[PDB]
Amino acid sequence: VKKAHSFRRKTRGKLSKHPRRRGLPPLTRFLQEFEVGQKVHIVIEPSYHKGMPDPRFHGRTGTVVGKRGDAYIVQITDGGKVKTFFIHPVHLRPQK
Amino acid sequence: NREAILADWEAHPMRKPRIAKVTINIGVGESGERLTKAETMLEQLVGQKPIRRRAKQTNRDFGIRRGEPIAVKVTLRGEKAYQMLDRLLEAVDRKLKASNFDEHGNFCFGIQEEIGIFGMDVCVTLERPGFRVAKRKRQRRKIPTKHKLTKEEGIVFAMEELKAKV
Amino acid sequence: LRPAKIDRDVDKPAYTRREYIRGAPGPKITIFDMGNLSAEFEYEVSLHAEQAMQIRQNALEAIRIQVNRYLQKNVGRSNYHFKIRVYPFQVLRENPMAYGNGMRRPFGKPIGLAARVRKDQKILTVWVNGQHLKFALGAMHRAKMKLPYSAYYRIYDKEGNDVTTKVLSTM
């Protein structure tokens, strides 16, 4: 039986947490700041459902190109295409 | 017994117990769905406004319309508790027993008796003063075993208050 | 029933979970400990699998009956603590085909149960004293006969060390 892709298909592990986190993250993540051109890792936090990208791109590294609202604009290169996302800083982590 | 409570009072009096509160329930229950005046019975004999207590899962005896008056209880504090006990303790048996007291030193009575119908359930719960931190909002915490209450401290407090014991 | 060479090997995924398998059967084996259970014997004679294997509960029960009757007729209930260590958890299935639809919708219905064993794994044990090692070895042989693959027996002492050669030399 062929099954279409959806937001939460095969996410049992990818969007779980070690039972010792089990709650709100420390607040230095919600209050991050990045600059245009900075490289960021995409690391989804499963307790915040706002500003969350397709989990297919969990584990990738992109670059910041701008800002809209409280969300940052992140560009990735999927194969030979550029894709643009508006992601909340709680799902991001800087490279070095 | 006396050993313990008197030695601990010699230490300091903040270890001395008291009556946290006196709760008078009508547990066996008789209301059903009517305003049977047990409300007024307890009201007149206590001295303030009563409260009901709604029901739970479907059953047989009473409490089958989940939400309906099924009982009446009142929680007295202050002097009023000492007062009501100064006649209820007299009413029912002297030499307060040992199976009245549970693992922690609070005890209960199961007395039962135009409307004069009532089967009551009394219970005194005791404590020392500094137990309000486990119920406070700020900096809440639990009580150690040192400042916690035992059984024979209850027995001696009860004898001295107004009774003998078995 | 169907030959055991169909179920011998272990090349299929594990199929041991009953909250999802519809119509699974109960076991035909209920006794795994026989004899004297609180008697602190000296020698422990244990069977060992030579390669990975899948044993049917039928074979297990036959082994049990034969070995226990032998040990009773020869040694005596007061001795010989006899134990089977493995339980049947695998579920075996057969395709309901043989009018028929052949290989259309082939997914077997459950028929039986089996225990999985890996290489150099213990299957059963006889705890006995010196004067009955002959009969313990006899039981080893009888059980060896009724198995799909081959197996080897070893002997152990208190502290569980191998004294098999020393005990085999001196009879």
């Binding site: 039972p19 010792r20 089990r22 709100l24 607040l27 919600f30 209050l31 | 909002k137 | -």
Partner: protein
């Protein structure tokens, strides 16, 4: 703490001193914070700015600094803090309340009113302020007949002369 699956809460939450949800909502703003705590016998207040290694305090005020725990003392605390802040070079702020519930007519909001009157911009709607007959003392004085307003106004004029 009972095994490998037991989550141990934050230290301040174990202690019973910080609400992190409200902390987040307040930090979402980049304006600074006006903290006001209250004890059985005293008040304290200060002005705080955020840093990821630890909050930094710029100003403070204590009822000891005053008398060198009620609505008049809180109003004078607000007076002091509002007069002190306008020096340091900050004219903006938002209130923080912690684990104190908001009740219409409390000394926390008395501090808010004092600081406002001192002239520090703090957004608010005048429906929670306590009554001025409570700020005065009429409450305690008229209790005493079954810190007179005189000395209240004395301290008032003192503080206002000092920070004119």
């Amino acid at each position: 703490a009972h095994g490998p699956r037991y989550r141990v809460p934050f230290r301040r939450r174990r202690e019973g001193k910080t609400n992190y949800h409200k902390r987040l909502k307040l930090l979402k703003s980049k304006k600074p914070r006006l903290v006001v705590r209250k004890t059985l016998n005293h008040h304290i207040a200060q002005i705080v700015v955020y840093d990821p290694k630890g909050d930094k305090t710029l100003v403070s005020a204590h009822t000891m600094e005053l008398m060198r725990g009620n609505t008049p003392s809180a109003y004078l605390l607000g007076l002091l803090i509002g007069y002190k802040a306008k020096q340091a070079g900050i004219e903006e702020a938002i209130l923080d309340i912690g684990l104190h519930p908001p009740t219409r007519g409390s000394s926390i909001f008395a501090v808010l009113k004092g600081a406002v009157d001192a002239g520090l911009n703090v957004p608010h709607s005048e429906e929670i302020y306590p009554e001025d007959y409570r700020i005065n003392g009429e409450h305690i004085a008229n209790y005493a007949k079954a810190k007179l307003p005189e000395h209240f106004e004395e301290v008032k004029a003192k503080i206002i002369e000092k920070f004119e």
